[PDB]
Each structure stands twice: as C-alpha cells, then as structure tokens.
Amino acid sequence: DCGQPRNLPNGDFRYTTTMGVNTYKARIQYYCHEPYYKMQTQGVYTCTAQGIWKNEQKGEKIPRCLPVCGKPVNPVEQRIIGGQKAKMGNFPWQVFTNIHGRGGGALLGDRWILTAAHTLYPKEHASLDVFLGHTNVEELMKLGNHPIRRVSVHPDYRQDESYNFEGDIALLELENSVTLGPNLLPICLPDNDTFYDLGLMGYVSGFGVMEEKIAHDLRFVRLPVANPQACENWLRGKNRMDVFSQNMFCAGHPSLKQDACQGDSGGVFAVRDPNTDRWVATGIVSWGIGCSRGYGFYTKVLNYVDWIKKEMEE
Secondary structure, three states: OOOOOOOOOOEEEEEOOOOOOOOOOOEEEEEEOOOOEEEOOOOEEEEOOOOOEEOOOOOOOOOOEEEOOOOOOOOOOOOOEOOOEOOOOOOOOEEEEEOOOEEEEEEEOOOEEEEOHHHOOOOOOOOOOEEEOOOEHHHHHHHOOOOEEEEEEOOOOOOOOOOOOOOOOEEEEEOOOOOOEOOEOOOEOOOOHHHHOOOOEEEEEEOOEOOOOEOOEOEEEEEEEOOHHHHHHHHHHOOOOOOOOOOEEEEOOOOOOOEOOOOOOOOEEEEEEOOOOEEEEEEEEEEOOOOOOOOEEEEEHHHOHHHHHHHHOO
C-alpha cells in the first residue's frame, strides 16, 4: 500500500494520481513553500511495487526544504533620524529587541537572531524579549515574544570598557524556529570583502528614536560606507579615544541628516548584493556619537561569518 506519505516540513505534497489513494503506481509531487524555502539539491515520488514511496533517483528519502535568505518579497523603493517608514516585506529580517531597552537584530536562517553584544551587555550597566514578523510595534507585541534558548556573545567583546566596541556582536538561538513568510525572512551573510567598498549604499532599519518622537513603526535610512581614515580623523578630531578596529567600519557622513539613533543598535546594515540580487548583512549597528551628526560605526560582519556559522552550526 505504502501508506500516507511522510510530511515534508516547510513544504507539502500533491497527488498527481487520485488524491488520498496510496497504492501501487500512486504519484505525489513534493514541493517547498517557495520563495521562503527552496528544495535542497525532483520531488516526484511513487508508490513502488515494493509498497514503498520512491523517487526515481533516491526513493526511500524525501526532500529537504531549506530557508531562503536575503530574497525579500517586497523590496524597498529607491527614490532612525532621517525619516522614511518601512513597508511590510521590505525587511522581513528585522527583529525587535527589548532586553535592557529597545533594540534590533536580524533573523539568520530559521532560528537564529544576529545582533549587537552591547545590546545584551550594555556599557555602564534582564528578560530576553524578542519579536519578529512585523513592521508595527503594537503588532509585534501582540504576536508575542519568541523565547530564547541560547545566547552567544563573541569572545572578544568586553563590557567593562565603555569605549571599546570591538567584537560587538552576538547570537540568539530561538527556542523554536519560526515559519518564514513575506514578513519574516532571514538575511544572508557576506562572503566577499567588496561588500565594504567606499560609497557603497547599505540600509539600516530600526525602531530607534527619530528626531522628536518615538517610533511606533519600523523606519529605515540609506547610508554610504564612509572612508575609515576620514572617520578615524573626525573621531580623534573630537579627541575621542574610542576603538576603531579592522573588525569595524564606518558609514554615513557628518553632513548627512539621515542616521541610526537610540534604539537601532543591534539592527543590521543591509546591502543588496547586485551580483545576486540578494541582501546581505554587512554590518551591525554598534556605536557612534549623537545622531544627526555623522560617521556611525558597525561591526564588520564579514569578519565573524565563520564564528557565526560555527555557533549556529551548533
């Protein structure tokens, strides 16, 4: 008979033959919930005369539906202090954080939230509150928080040193993975050093603290990767002795009026890789000085990519 087909997590199967009938010559075609998930690599299985559900090439083994990163359904339009409110589906990876205070993160894979270490262990200092899958703050609250099982702060980060954000970056493993959708999708990780070329325009979305009021909805701003040197000057120019390592990078400009502010840290600096039309998280909103001013600092994710993979590789 073959019995009922195994259920394909994050995917489903359809009968090409008479529905519900699981006997010889029975034919079902498995499929993954695309574009949120993609089938690892043709989904066609039949009830073999051996009374087993088998695919021409494999058989005994059903497909695997893996999560798809950085390929949002409703991309941002080309034409946080600095304005503009994000639309549903623009940043399916944005996460809302409320540990010590409002913060942000980015969904990685299907059960990991990437964010800023300082977001967990602040300078001069709780319930790990995390929400995802929505633009409006009330809604994320109603949707409920997503319990956290593991917390993985990078080794280099140090909390006692209030002016050293080196290694600022952490990982949050959700207790239970989520179900991707047009409004909840992971972002990809960088892999080429070019994701830091000067003048490169990346995005920073968050529920920070805009100009004069609190933000009830996710907002975003586009910023260009700035020249380190210039930032390095500007920084010492104001006599700041803050750390600015190769493991960081700066963006924005002192003359820009758009910028991430109080509450956007932990959020991510997103770049739509033109080469693949997929969005990668090149940086983590780490620190700066004031807001509307200029030159913000972000953790160079590209340098922790391996560290991240290991932590979530389990």
